[PDB]
């Protein structure tokens, strides 16, 4: 019984994306959501929908939506499947196995690759433990490999938390820029505020 639309273009035509460690988010509700529009548009690399059928999407009513945005290289996208481990899946972002929603991805090389390199995008290698599902880590502390107490000083056994990405067109398919937006949905007994195109 609402008419206003969801900001899908703003979600996707957004100029700037976040890094993998910090990413982005959107609590989306009280809007109309057209997915037959999106599903056959594929200005995207991957539609990988878990707990949901992509044909059903426009049919679906959703209580709320949460949106995540971050850019990755081609090799390590596969790590984002739940029940799988990877230096992202371990030390950048954890995905719950009982995930309802859909990950969407797309190479963005002419946008996010520059010949001199785009090192504003960060990639966490070290953490004392893997994160729990759906967690961010903006910590600015130097990682201690060994017993040496860094106390905020880099050096031996004192590591850079987030290595800067080298995105250039020189990058291979597995090293190019791929903007990725994950659409997490909750299938809960609640007012379905994100009803798709229906009557």
């Amino acid at each position, epitope marked *: 019984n609402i008419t206003n639309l969801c900001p899908f273009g703003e979600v996707f035509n957004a100029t700037r994306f976040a890094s993998v460690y910090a990413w982005n988010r959107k609590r989306i509700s009280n809007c109309v959501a057209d997915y037959s529009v999106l599903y056959n*548009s594929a*200005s*995207f690399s991957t539609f990988k929908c878990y707990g949901v059928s992509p044909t059903k999407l426009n049919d679906l009513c959703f209580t709320n939506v949460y949106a995540d945005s971050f850019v990755i290289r081609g090799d390590e996208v596969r790590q984002i499947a739940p029940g799988q481990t990877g230096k992202i899946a371990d030390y950048n972002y954890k995905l719950p196995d009982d995930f309802t929603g859909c990950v969407i991805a797309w190479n963005s090389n002419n946008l996010d690759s520059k010949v001199g390199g785009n090192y504003n995008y960060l990639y966490r290698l070290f953490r004392k433990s893997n994160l729990k599902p759906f967690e961010r880590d903006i910590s600015t502390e130097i990682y201690q490999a060994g017993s040496t107490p860094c106390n905020g000083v880099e050096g031996f056994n004192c590591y850079f938390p987030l290595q800067s990405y080298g995105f250039q067109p020189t990058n291979g398919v597995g090293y190019q820029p791929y903007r990725v937006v994950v659409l997490s949905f909750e299938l809960l007994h609640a007012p379905a505020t994100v009803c798709g195109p229906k009557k």
Partner: nanobody
Amino acid sequence: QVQLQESGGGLVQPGGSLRLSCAASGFTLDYYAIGWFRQAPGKEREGVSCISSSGGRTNYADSVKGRFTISRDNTKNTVYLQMNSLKPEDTAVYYCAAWEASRWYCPLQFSADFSSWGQGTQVTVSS
């Protein structure tokens, strides 16, 4: 269990003809648009051709237009590729991969992403 298997590649004489079929197992390739790609020794994967999920919107590379033909048996869940007027340049490894309708406007003329990567097959032309 998404598995794409390319078959029918090999050595052919210049001026001859050949056929590939890659078969899809574990999934419905019918919902998928398929691109056939090629990398030779010393060159990157080029866009040879692309066909829709329904087979209605198409692309051929300028180098392969008018000699090669894509088709798909959606009932039998495979995609076929007929090559005619073979040239020695065509010696290269092939893959077929799957993605969906990639823009406003239908056709698959533009490159896209290519999710299901098959093993690939070497098609050699020499005499």
